[PDB]
Design a protein around this ligand. Structure first.
Ligand SMILES: Nc1nc2c(ncn2[C@@H]2O[C@H](COP(=O)(O)OP(=O)(O)OP(=O)(O)O)[C@@H](O)[C@H]2O)c(=O)[nH]1
Ligand SMILES: Nc1nc2c(ncn2[C@@H]2O[C@H](COP(=O)(O)OP(=O)(O)OP(=O)(O)O)[C@@H](O)[C@H]2O)c(=O)[nH]1
Ligand SMILES: Nc1nc2c(ncn2[C@@H]2O[C@H](COP(=O)(O)OP(=O)(O)O)[C@@H](O)[C@H]2O)c(=O)[nH]1
Ligand SMILES: [Mg+2]
Ligand SMILES: [Mg+2]
Lengths: 432, 51, 206, 430, 202, 439
């Protein structure tokens, strides 16, 4: 009787939500039509129709019809509810003002209506997950507006945002710094937990570990899906040390302002060489803390650690976990902040990770995912602040936002908020 | 303009009789099909090939 | 050649000579130091393969001669010539076949469920209720399915059972990861996202 | 990996490449249609060194044919294996230089070189990690001797860390088929010594004499000479394309074969060479190969190496051999002829082994020897150049296009100083 | 003197068996043991494996050393090392439960010293037993009725051996294993009495 | 629970390591793909392969060694060869550009971008081991990349791990036979680098083993791989005490406690016996006394040095087979009695003796035969200074006129780097002559 509801806004959000949804259905044994192959646990993510098919607890929002059309013409035509796939007509065209004040204001109504219908059915609602690429106008604007509306409606209900920030130097658009800063300002005082999932780091991981030299978006979305499964496994499977989603905001955020943290996963390996080694829990947890394996392009060696919450799934043993944590604390290249004597939260789950046939991953009996909050994440804020400043000095591209209802001084207050956030980071980073 | 071996006959040199319009020929790994030949060639056939 | 041919299995098992062996009864040698022409030392310039084996090779006439060589024995490298398995005392992997079998069975189970000839449920005759698109009016509304023909379903079937202990070989052989050679055309046709393991197989298969 | 491109200019370079790539295609089992037809896996293991790939599974040259007169390339395109070359890689002028170094280096070459530099820049960017550049040209022709050297200078200006090796066919005084050989040979070597990382010199009289005395053919042909040169210069880089006991790339040869930066002109040779009627009474052995190799006559330059002391030498044995006989024989020949090796460089010999011999052969040797005997070629070319220049004859032609006699004076000073400093080490004692 | 030719000729032949230990204490009747026989000089080694989460400090139990059977006062040989036999080393007695498939290949590939593993010898044994009964056919029908009381067509090893002991004639467990392994079509130790019947006569 | 980590650098290191690992796999029964055979399915006993290998949980075993090179030919070649499935794929670290016999290139230009990955793999291999004994390093000293990478890796390891023992098996160039022409330079610089950074350094000169193959194995036309097999057998003899039972066990930690009197004096040379082929091996007794006499015979010394030209400092000698302490001591008594070999006065005893029961194993297609008795000796002595003196003379002849120096100058090294190495080698020669004098 415990449920979580998923919001999927923006093109990247939709095509990664597809990715996570094949994984969940395959892991619960759900056929693509949603009917059972004649075989409670799935209750977290699905809701019964009375006899037979199941409805996923997801809603997809977009203004550009092509991706929703692709989903509704794909193999999962009859899985999702046909009027929870909300599609608009005119794309925001990477314009944050368009997606925040002009068009999405008339679509958030039905988004909240569908949330109302999906939530009143639920009984022990745990919280909401939200997926949105930041480098997209409609994604950022709709995500911001939905977060503000859900804060004033729901309030204390937990919301977790998996944002994919643009890479420090590799970018697809040219005006993504503006909407990135605006969206960060918007969600800073509205979301509870925000995960860093930039693309350059996952690209490097795919190149190095899986031995893929020309990967595409599908593989990235698959790995993000595996991370989601790792996070939510304890919610629907028995384990020695299970945690709820609600056991995060009391463990990984020191202060209400600091709630942006970065993830990592292990092991990631190909079918060539998964079976040539033990996959020992000690070495996988060392690979987890290996700096180059971070899911975000940030260097942990340049900053202190506040907190680390780590999930293991498989046949791990508490003796082994304790012994590895002891070695980690012994190691000198990793240092924690002074006012945090112990910073480890651990969760254990019995069910092994599931492997997708025809995919890249091999089947391994042990896996671990870390969610870490550390001082080093200030560097992305600094670099995007420089990027925004270089633009806003000469007022480039400003008209494309001014003409659609944006006030001129709106950028200045977001800049001030980012500077205040950085100064808070500096203040908390010093020892007493 | 140089003498070329023929794969079709025991790796031997080309001969004027080998050049046969209507039938394919191989010249150094290249496949040619002769469509028409000059009436001077017609005459030289008619006066020489007849045996 | 003498090293891998002589001490044969019959001789080593319940026989006079063991692995190293005073293998002199089996065939003739020249008992180290000897002054004379042995018909093969100054011409073929044999390497390693101690003087007994040098003389044995010449005497038993396995040999090779001439200033011309043709292709196959021309192109061998010393690494494989010397470190050629363990061979002769007691008589590699079965793999590549199990995963290729996994491959054809996946495609088999895939194309074995396209729901041929109006076998789909009453729903999905028409597209989803909210579809947008075009929906032309001067066209047959219900979708028509051709589907694979029973013969191609069987096409996969005898093959996948024949790969189970059958005549067709496990195909090709490949290197593992770091091989820097051409590997036959990953660049000409992109094959962009195909799992370097499987890239090797596909690119060598063509 | 560690691949290299081919740049050829001038008629001589074009006809060198025409036979060299036939040799390479035969070695790697490539048909004249660009389709692989080999027998072993190794024929594709280092195929990326000289070949790129095209759609349809075919192979394509990484060679640029570039010239100021298009007749030569129009003739070579029709040749066997000639359809491999990219039509785009061909670049040509429409005027001609008339064997004028000045015309080929200042007026037409300067304006023409933009496109060829662009295409070479494209090819260099295309390769994963470049090893260097090889050039083949003759110093007796004006367009080659000037424009190729200008290209070398520009290439060195952009790629200072890459290795440069140039095959210079200097005009010997005995076969002098043009009278302007001294001027352009000197103007070419002046620029060549300053920027070229390394050079092999080749002599037509040397090829003629070798063919007549060793191979004993009635009517030698430029095809046979090109085949000799192609086999000889493919031997040095074969060990880069095939495994062996001791791998030795061109960078290793450059490191181990020049004591000083300005002394990078070598004399080379190939073994074995036997006539058709005499090819059967010998058996190839290491002593036979080395004794035929260190003969003065077998060298591809008319310079007599026994008139001086070898600064250093390098030998690439190629074929299935092992090391004891090779190094014991090399030590033996070093001890036996101690008078011909300068003393303050003990063990002045490099030895390397490649496992795959030439097609149709068991053993082969590619030799590169840096000795002070090459000075006499510079002596004779300088005396001929001063015989030309003291009367200022044939000089108005050069001076009519912007350059003057100061360039000739500084060039002659440079080569005389090079000769003096090069022979200085000949008489040096420890 | 030491037999050097023996060392050189049969150094590689190593016999691996699995066994269970019959001895004094009740506590140690469960753990498993692996016996190694080196025929270079007829030497025996014993190892004790410890399955995970047991608490036994498993390790090397007896080293490479050579000793003889006490009663016959003769050193053990490869003939004595047959599966299902009881061998006493010093004070410790072992029952040879299982052998390696390499060991079985060696057994079958070297006859005229290992007669009990030879299938035609075992079948000839069982058939020449039948001289006691009056007729061959009634002997065979009594045989089949006694091994299969309910006529199922497939049995277990215990049922086969108890039926044969009920008959009373003496086959060792080694011949029993030979027949039982040979007449298992899908390698799960289920006898095919129909194949046994047709092999005997039909 | 005792392990040791092996490192190979240079193509010579790769070719010798391949010979070592084929012999180790044959010794422990590892078929090339990794399983024991597929034909034996119990195992689960007498864990000794843990000395060199590591269990994957079910099936194959992984070697505890790392390969380093900058020219990819040998790495691709081995990755294509017979042991393709054995090695873990990212253990064979290969660069793109070779150092080209330049120590500067491999120590200051291109080795720094590969040393990070090398140390990463070293950590990933060290963490699994619990009672790891020490490190072995193999390198040809006459090659640029091998010398530079070995030097800088030793530099990093000596501070990353500190007190842990490291043994270096360097292949020094022959006194008069050479393959390259610039080997004195990088040999001197590498020696200077390793002098204060290696615990034990064993000489591996090629000419001596060439003579051994010519004389004993009766091979008139040998290759490198025969020498590699000999060195591999020496390695197996050295390491067998740690993975095989014996009446008297010796560890690698029992070498820097018995073999080197002073921290500066850690270069020694070895010898092995018997070396004979079965075509003439079985005709002779192969007694322990005679094999030990052959071992101390100067012409059998595996490095080209004359022990009669200097005093002996220490001798660690080890038997494998069916030896007995009576015969051991009886042989040692004859050795000490015989006059032609003299010890230094401050060492009345200098012998350390090791015993192992496992006889040497014979490789198919090899030259050596199978013998029930074998002896391998490692001696540290003062006679080794001759090679250093002649190499110093060679280097001085080269440096008198500043030849080839621009190649090292233009790759980022300071000019006077040669001077400090020259002073260090002069000081080492002075130290050796001072130690060799009587009290
Ligand atoms: N990691 C990841 N990033 C994506 C993916 N798809 C899009 N992005 C990022 O999203 C940015 C642009 O936003 P999109 O998601 O493509 O489109 P949108 O969010 O709907 O915004 P609009 O383009 O205005 O409709 C690009 O710069 C990409 O970096 C994806 O599948 N995975
Ligand atoms: N005994 C023996 N010596 C070898 C072998 N390979 C190389 N050497 C020695 O190594 C020296 C040259 O160095 P190499 O090992 O070939 O190459 P390197 O050490 O990696 O350095 P680079 O040449 O720059 O690549 C030669 O003089 C040989 O004496 C081998 O297989 N066996
Ligand atoms: N190896 C070789 N050299 C040639 C050949 N033809 C001409 N040469 C040499 O090239 C020189 C003349 O070069 P030239 O035609 O002026 O070159 P260009 O100025 O680039 O056209 C002569 O000295 C010849 O020795 C040939 O077929 N092979
Ligand atoms: Mg979009
Ligand atoms: Mg090398």
């Amino acid at each position: 009787m415990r449920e979580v509801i998923s919001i999927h806004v923006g093109q990247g959000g939709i095509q990664v939500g597809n990715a996570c949804w094949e994984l969940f259905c395959l892991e619960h044994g759900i056929q693509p039509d949603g009917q059972m192959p004649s075989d409670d646990a799935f209750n977290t993510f699905f809701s019964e129709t009375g006899a037979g098919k199941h409805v996923p607890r997801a809603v997809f929002l977009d203004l550009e019809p092509t991706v929703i059309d692709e989903v509704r013409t794909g193999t999962y035509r009859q899985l999702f509810h046909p009027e929870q796939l909300i599609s608009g007509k005119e794309d925001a065209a990477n314009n944050f003002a368009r997606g925040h004040y002009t068009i999405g204001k008339e679509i958030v109504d039905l988004c909240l209506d569908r949330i109302r219908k999906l939530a009143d059915n639920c009984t022990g609602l745990q919280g909401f997950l939200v997926f949105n690429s930041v480098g997209g106008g409609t994604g950022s604007g709709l995500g911001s507006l939905l977060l503000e509306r859900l804060s004033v409606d729901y309030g204390k209900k937990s919301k977790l945002g998996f944002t994919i920030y643009p890479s420090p130097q590799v970018s697809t658009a040219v005006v993504e710094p503006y909407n990135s800063i605006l969206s960060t300002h918007s969600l800073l005082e509205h979301t509870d937990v925000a995960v860093m999932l930039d693309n350059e780091a996952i690209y490097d991981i795919c190149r190095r570990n899986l031995d893929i030299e020309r990967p595409t978006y599908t593989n990235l979305n698959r790995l993000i899906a595996q991370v989601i499964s790792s996070l939510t496994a304890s919610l629907r499977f028995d384990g020695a040390l299970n945690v709820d989603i609600t056991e995060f905001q009391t463990n990984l955020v020191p202060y209400p302002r600091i709630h942006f943290m970065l993830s990592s996963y292990a092991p990631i390996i190909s079918a060539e060489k998964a079976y040539h080694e033990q996959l020992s829990v000690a070495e996988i947890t060392n690979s987890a803390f290996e700096p180059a394996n971070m899911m975000a392009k940030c260097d942990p060696r340049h900053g202190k650690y506040m907190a680390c919450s780590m999930m293991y799934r498989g046949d791990v043993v508490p003796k082994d976990v304790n012994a590895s944590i002891a070695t980690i604390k012994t190691k000198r290249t990793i240092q924690f902040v002074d006012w945090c004597p112990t910073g480890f939260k651990v969760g254990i789950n019995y069910q092994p990770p599931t492997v997708v046939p025809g995919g890249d991953l091999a089947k391994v009996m042990r896996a671990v995912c870390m969610i870490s909050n550390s001082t080093a994440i200030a560097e992305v804020f600094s670099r995007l602040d420089h990027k925004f400043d270089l633009m806003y000095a000469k007022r480039a591209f400003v008209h494309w936002y001014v003409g659609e209802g944006m006030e001129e001084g709106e950028f200045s207050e977001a800049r001030e908020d980012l500077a205040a956030l950085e100064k808070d980071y500096e203040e908390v980073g010093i020892e007493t | 303009k140089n003498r070329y071996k023929n794969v079709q006959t025991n790796n031997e040199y080309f001969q004027p009789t080998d050049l046969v319009v209507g039938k394919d020929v191989i010249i150094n790994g290249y496949s040619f099909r002769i469509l028409e030949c000059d009436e001077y060639t017609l005459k030289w056939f008619a006066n020489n090939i007849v045996q | 050649n003498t090293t891998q041919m002589i001490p044969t299995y019959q001789d080593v098992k319940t026989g006079t000579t063991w692995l190293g062996g005073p293998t002199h009864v089996l065939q003739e040698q020249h008992i180290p130091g000897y002054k004379g022409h042995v018909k093969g030392v100054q011409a073929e310039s044999l390497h390693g393969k101690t003087f007994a084996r040098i003389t044995a090779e010449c005497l038993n006439n396995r040999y090779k001669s001439g200033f011309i060589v043709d292709d196959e024995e021309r192109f061998k490298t010393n690494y494989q010539l010397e470190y050629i398995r363990p061979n002769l005392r007691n008589n590699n992997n079965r793999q590549r076949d199990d995963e290729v079998e996994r491959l054809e069975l996946i495609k088999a189970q895939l194309n074995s469920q396209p729901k041929t000839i109006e076998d789909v449920p009453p729903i999905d005759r028409v597209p989803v209720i909210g579809y947008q698109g075009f929906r032309p009016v001067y066209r047959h509304p219900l979708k028509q399915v051709k589907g694979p023909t029973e013969d191609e379903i069987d096409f996969q079937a005898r093959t996948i059972l024949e790969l189970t202990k059958g005549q067709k070989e496990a195909p090709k052989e490949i290197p593992i990861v770091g091989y820097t050679g051409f590997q036959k055309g990953i660049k000409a046709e992109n094959m962009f996202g195909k799992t370097f393991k499987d890239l090797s197989n596909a690119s060598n298969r063509i | 990996m560690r691949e290299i491109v081919h740049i050829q200019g001038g008629q001589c370079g074009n006809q060198i490449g025409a036979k060299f790539w036939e040799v390479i295609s035969d070695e790697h089992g490539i048909d004249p249609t660009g389709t692989y037809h080999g027998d072993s896996d190794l024929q594709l293991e280092r195929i990326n060194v000289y070949y790129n790939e095209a759609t349809g599974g075919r192979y394509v040259p990484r060679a640029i044919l570039m010239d100021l007169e298009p007749g030569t390339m129009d003739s070579v395109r029709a040749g066997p294996f000639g359809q491999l070359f990219r039509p785009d890689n061909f670049v040509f002028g429409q005027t001609g230089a008339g064997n004028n170094w000045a015309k080929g280096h200042y007026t037409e070459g300067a304006e023409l070189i933009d496109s060829v530099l662009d295409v070479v820049r494209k090819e260099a960017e295309g390769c994963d990690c470049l090893q260097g550049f090889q050039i083949t040209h003759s110093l007796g022709g004006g367009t080659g001797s000037g424009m190729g050297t200008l290209l070398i200078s520009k290439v060195r200006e952009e790629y200072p860390d890459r290795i440069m090796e140039t095959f210079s066919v200097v005009p010997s005084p005995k076969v002098s088929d043009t009278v302007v050989e001294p001027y352009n040979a000197t103007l070419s070597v002046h620029q060549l010594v300053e920027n070229a990382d390394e050079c092999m010199v080749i002599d037509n009289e040397a090829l003629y004499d070798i063919c007549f005395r060793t191979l004993k053919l009635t009517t030698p042909t430029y095809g046979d000479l090109n085949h000799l040169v192609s086999a000889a210069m493919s031997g040095v880089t074969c060990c880069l394309r095939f495994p062996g006991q001791l791998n030795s790339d061109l960078r290793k040869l450059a490191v181990n074969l020049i004591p000083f930066p300005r002394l990078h002109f070598f004399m080379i040779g190939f073994a074995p060479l036997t006539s058709r009627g005499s090819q059967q009474y010998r058996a190839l052995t290491v002593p036979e190969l080395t004794q035929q190799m260190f003969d003065a006559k077998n060298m591809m330059c008319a310079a007599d190496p026994r008139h001086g002391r070898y600064l250093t030498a390098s030998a690439l044995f190629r074929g299935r051999m092992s090391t004891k006989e090779v190094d014991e024989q090399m030590l033996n020949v070093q001890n036996k002829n101690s008078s011909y090796f300068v003393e303050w460089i003990p063990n002045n010999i490099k030895s390397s082994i490649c496992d795959i011999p030439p097609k149709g052969l068991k053993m082969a040797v590619t030799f590169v020897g840096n000795s002070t005997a090459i000075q006499e070629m510079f002596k004779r070319v300088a005396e001929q150049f001063t015989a030309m220049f003291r009367r200022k004859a044939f000089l108005h032609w050069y001076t009519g296009e912007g350059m003057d006699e100061m360039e000739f004076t500084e060039a002659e000073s440079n080569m005389n100083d090079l000769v003096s400093e090069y022979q200085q080490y000949q008489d040096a004692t420890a | 003197r030491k037999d050097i030719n023996k060392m050189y000729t049969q150094d590689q032949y190593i016999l691996r068996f699995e066994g269970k230990l019959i001895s004094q204490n009740k506590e140690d009747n469960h753990r498993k043991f692996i016996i190694s026989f080196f025929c270079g000089d007829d030497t025996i080694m014993v190892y004790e494996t410890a399955d995970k989460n047991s608490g036994i400090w498993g390790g090397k139990f007896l080293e490479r050393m050579n000793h003889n059977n006490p009663i016959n006062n003769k050193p053990y040989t490869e003939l004595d090392f047959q599966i299902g036999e009881i061998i006493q080393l010093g004070v410790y007695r072992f029952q040879l439960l299982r052998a390696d498939e390499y060991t079985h290949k060696y057994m079958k590939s070297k006859p005229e010293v290992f007669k009990e593993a030879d299938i035609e010898y075992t079948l000839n044994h069982l058939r020449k037993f039948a001289t006691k009964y009056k007729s061959y056919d009634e002997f065979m029908v009594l045989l089949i009725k006694n091994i299969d009381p309910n006529r199922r067509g497939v049995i277990d090893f215990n049922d086969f051996v108890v039926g044969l002991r009920r008959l009373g004639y003496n086959l060792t467990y080694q011949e029993i294993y030979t027949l039982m392994r040979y007449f298992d079509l899908d390698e799960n130790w289920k006898l095919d009495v129909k194949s046994l019947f047709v092999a005997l006569g039909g």
